[PDB]
Design a protein around this ligand. Structure first.
Ligand code: DGD
Ligand code: CLA
Ligand code: CLA
Ligand code: HEM
Lengths: 98, 242, 137, 195, 49
């Protein structure tokens, strides 16, 4: 019977160390060679992935794109979708600007 | 035929489309036709808040409430593929649209009960063996109701969920525990459940209107108070196309 | 004395060559940067889309590399997202698209090289104050 | 030649206490009506010095709260002023959160002694209360404290022979002036024009 | 039901009922009604009066 903050806790999972495909703000996508712009719109769109790799099998991904993801696969992780983190279409615009 | 400069101000854009009394003429559904919905609209009128019954255990009540925020209530522009699965029943799966209007009605007492009138992630279906939508047909299904507020949001005094001061703050050496309710802000997720019966249908237009009744929950307020139950009533239009 | 020669010297090509610079060009850089418009872009952020900044690192991770006194030139000539996937020419000042953003007409390879050098140079002095806004101000 | 434990369990009660911002006279409030006790409460005992360890093992310090602030964000700086831990506000772009940097707390001396706490919540907590100096255990129930500081006698007394003395010089200026001009006191003297 | 005026230590409001003022401009009554709110002449009135 000990209620606890959700974001704070999920900051304790691998979510805080890497990029979370299913939750993480779409903004943390620029920090790598050519990912942000489009790949992200597809990374972020496209259902939530149970496995970190199911990224590679995304409908219509390009022969090059496919590559990139593979290449960057290093930094992606996953944790249960977080209701509090995804609701409000925050993932597109978290409220965090420079 | 009406321009925005013609309808703005009437507080009409909050009341949505009617179908004149040339209805009852069922819409010819195929089973050979894909079919989708165009701007499904739910205009409401009756907000009832199930009265937090006193400790006594005899039939909890559903009091009537007064609307506050003028006209910021109705919801439409909802669209979604209208599935025609086996046994000839129609299931409508909403993909997106304006559907989360935040309203705050004033309870019997002076209470200000705020809920998030919404029919999001909606999956409504009707009766089986139906090749035609008519005064007969009806739709029942589930919802998804987040919470009045987003993830960020700072209650006065700075606290918050995905941000915010994190504690008692104003009170430094105060007694930590018992404020848990306030400090850690939990975030709710619950089911809705509407019900849609048609009353006016046009055969060609794909248009169909009728009354609806949604029963959902109110404001979790991060953790503050246990939400209050709410039933919602009003008419709804919803044009159908192939 | 403080605005020294090499501190005014920056990377030219994705291959290493350095163009160093002058007090003259630098100036046009300032004059330019602002005239070429800091209106969204004032200081070192990006008001139309705050997610992208002009800090040295950010330009490196761009595609193609955009930290080259060269890079920025292609851009200003023809613009591309951080994908380098689709030309953003119609929504961004560019010589490719002058008829949209007038200020971009009177611009020249001389004027460009300058506004360019201004971008790769400013960080060197201002430190973080370049990328950040409000916070560092 | 002593256990870091025997070390702090060595330090004397009363003294740790002095190192508790809660006695630093300034922190009070002009209307904060009472004795320092209906504030942090009744000090019952010293818990122990709280040294915060990194996940890497590095020792950290809670960057204290300077007398001027009633509010304050806890920050754990590397022994050399560097920043290795904090309690985020944005929390969506957190780079140094206790949880993502595995902060932790051990205790030497006090009553807590030789104990350590690991769970991200309590570790945090213990820190925020460390920003006050030496953590302690206050019985608040008895007097029913509020959770806000008050100022020490020394504090009041000063503010006393303060507004008091700052006024008296006005009496000085007033009587001195009514001592010397006891002449004009009545009227200006109907006679005029010379000067 | 279990908190009618008389327990709450009501002394003057008990009368507003005898005569007839059953409710307050706030949608409630002493019987425990709903939707029906008195005219100006409702508790508040009697007082504002
Ligand atoms: C209303 C009527 C007005 C009439 C107006 C008439 C105008 C005439 C003006 C003439 C006088 C004004 C100029 C006086 C300057 C005196 C310099 C001074 O301040 O002297 C400087 C020192 C201060 O020492 C302080 O000491 C502190 C700590 O040191 C001490 O404590 C440390 C530990 O923290 C160490 O232990 C250290 O060893 C130990 O010395 C810090 O170091 C500080 O930086 C340092 O300033 O004061 C001292 O020794 C001297 C003793 C102080 C006497 C003060 C007399 C009145 C004014 C002070 C009242 C302040 C409180 C007001 C309360 C509210 C209302 C009154
Ligand atoms: C007119 C008659 C009358 C009656 C029957 C009541 C009855 C009541 N009042 Mg009330 N009240 C009245 C007049 C009355 N009031 C007036 C005129 C005022 C304005 C000053 C108030 C202000 C008031 C408040 C603020 C409250 C009440 C409350 C109440 C209720 C609680 C009982 C209580 O407080 O009494 C207390 C009983 C006593 C104190 C008994 C002993 C007190 C005195 C009479 C003893 C000494 C009398 C005299 C001075 C002796 C000296 C004589 C001399 C020769 C030496 C009760 C229903 C309470 C309530 O229910 O909700 C608000 C309450 O909070 N009243
Ligand atoms: C706030 C400024 C102020 C003003 C406007 C007055 C005005 C007055 N005072 Mg007075 N007084 C003051 C401050 C002031 N006082 C202070 C701080 C004291 C210390 C107790 C006094 C003590 C005093 C006495 C005992 C008397 C007066 C009296 C008077 C009245 C007659 C004039 C006088 O006595 O000489 C004015 C005196 C001065 C202007 C002092 C000169 C300043 C010093 C000597 C200069 C040297 C300071 C030094 C160089 C600074 C170096 C700084 C260093 C510490 C770092 C007159 C109304 C008389 C009175 O009213 O009785 C009828 C009287 O008997 N005063
Ligand atoms: C005139 C001087 C300007 C220069 C030198 C300049 C330079 C740049 C550069 C280098 C980028 C890409 C950053 C990166 O990915 O590393 C960029 C992006 C961008 N710029 Fe500018 N810019 C200028 C003016 C403007 C103006 C006036 C606007 C106003 C519309 C603007 C709007 C944008 C937008 C919206 C982007 C993001 C592109 C996207 O991802 O859609 N810029 N700019």
């Amino acid at each position: 019977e000990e209620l606890v903050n959700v974001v704070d806790e999920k900051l304790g999972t691998a979510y805080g160390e890497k990029i979370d495909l299913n939750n993480t703000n779409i903004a943390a996508f620029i920090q790598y060679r050519g990912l942000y712009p489009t790949l992200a719109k597809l990374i972020v769109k496209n259902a939530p992935y149970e496995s970190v790799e199911d990224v590679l099998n995304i409908p219509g991904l390009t022969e090059r794109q496919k590559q990139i993801l593979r290449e960057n696969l290093e930094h992606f992780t996953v944790t249960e979708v977080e209701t509090a983190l995804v609701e409000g279409g925050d993932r597109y615009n978290n409220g965090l600007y420079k | 035929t009406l321009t925005y400069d013609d309808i703005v101000g009437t507080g009409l854009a909050n009341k949505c489309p009617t179908l004149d009394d040339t209805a009852r003429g069922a819409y010819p559904i195929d089973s050979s036709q894909t079919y989708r919905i165009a701007r499904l609209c739910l205009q409401p009128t009756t907000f009832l808040v199930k009265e937090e019954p006193k400790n006594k255990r005899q039939e909890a009540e559903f009091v009537p409430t007064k609307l506050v925020t003028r006209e910021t209530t109705s919801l439409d522009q909802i669209q979604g593929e209208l599935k025609v699965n086996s046994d000839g029943s129609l299931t409508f799966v909403e993909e997106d649209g304006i559907d989360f209007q935040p309203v705050t009605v004033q309870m019997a007492g002076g209470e200000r009960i705020p809920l998030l009138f919404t029919v999001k992630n909606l999956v409504a279906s009707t009766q089986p063996n139906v090749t035609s939508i008519t005064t007969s047909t009806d739709f029942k299904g589930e919802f998804n109701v987040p919470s009045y507020r987003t993830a960020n949001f700072l209650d006065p005094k700075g606290r918050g969920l995905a941000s915010g001061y994190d504690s008692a703050i104003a009170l430094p050496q105060a007694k930590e525990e018992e404020l848990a309710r306030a400090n850690v802000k939990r975030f709710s997720l619950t089911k809705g459940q509407i019900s849609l019966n048609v009353a006016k249908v046009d055969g060609r237009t794909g248009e169909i209107a009728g009354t609806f009744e949604s029963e959902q929950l109110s404001d979790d307020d991060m953790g503050a108070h246990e939400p209050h139950e709410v039933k919602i009533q009003g008419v709804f239009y919803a044009s159908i196309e192939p | 004395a403080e605005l020294t020669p090499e501190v005014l010297t920056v990377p030219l090509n994705s291959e290493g060559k350095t163009i160093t610079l002058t007090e003259k060009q630098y100036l046009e850089g300032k004059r330019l940067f602002q005239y070429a418009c800091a209106s969204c872009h004032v200081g070192g952020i990006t008001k139309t889309n705050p997610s992208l900044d002009l800090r040295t690192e950010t330009l490196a991770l761009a595609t193609p590399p955009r930290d080259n006194i060269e890079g920025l030139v292609d851009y200003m000539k023809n613009p591309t997202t951080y994908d380098g996937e689709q030309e953003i020419a119609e929504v961004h000042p560019s010589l490719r698209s002058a008829d949209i953003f007038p200020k971009m007409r009177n611009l020249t390879e001389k004027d460009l090289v300058a506004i360019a050098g201004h971008i790769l140079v400013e960080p060197k002095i201002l430190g973080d104050k370049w990328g950040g806004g409000k916070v560092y101000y | 030649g002593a256990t870091l434990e025997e070390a702090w369990s060595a330090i004397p009660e009363k003294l740790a206490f002095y190192d508790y911002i809660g006695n630093n006279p300034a922190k009070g409030g002009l209307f904060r009506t009472g004795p320092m006790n209906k504030g942090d409460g009744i000090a019952q005992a010293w818990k122990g010095h709280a040294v915060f360890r990194n996940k890497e093992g590095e020792e950290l310090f809670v960057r204290r709260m300077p007398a001027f602030f009633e509010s304050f964000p806890v920050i754990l700086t590397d022994k050399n002023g560097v920043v290795k831990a904090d309690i985020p506000f944005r929390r969506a772009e957190s780079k140094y959160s206790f949880e993502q940097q595995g902060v932790t707390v051990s205790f030497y001396g006090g009553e807590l002694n030789g104990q350590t706490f690991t769970d991200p919540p309590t570790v945090k907590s213990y820190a925020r209360k460390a920003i006050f100096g030496e953590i302690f255990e206050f019985d608040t129930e008895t007097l029913n404290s509020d959770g806000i500081f008050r100022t020490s006698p020394r504090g009041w007394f000063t503010f006393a022979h303060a507004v008091f003395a700052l006024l008296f010089f006005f009496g000085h200026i007033w009587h001195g002036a009514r001592t010397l001009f006891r002449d004009v006191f009545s009227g200006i003297d109907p006679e005029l024009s010379p000067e | 039901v279990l908190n009618p005026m008389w327990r709450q230590g009501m002394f003057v409001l008990p009368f507003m009922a005898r005569l007839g003022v059953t409710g307050s401009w706030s949608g409630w009554s002493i019987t425990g009604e709903t939707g029906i709110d008195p005219g100006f002449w409702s508790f508040e009135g009697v007082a504002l009066a």
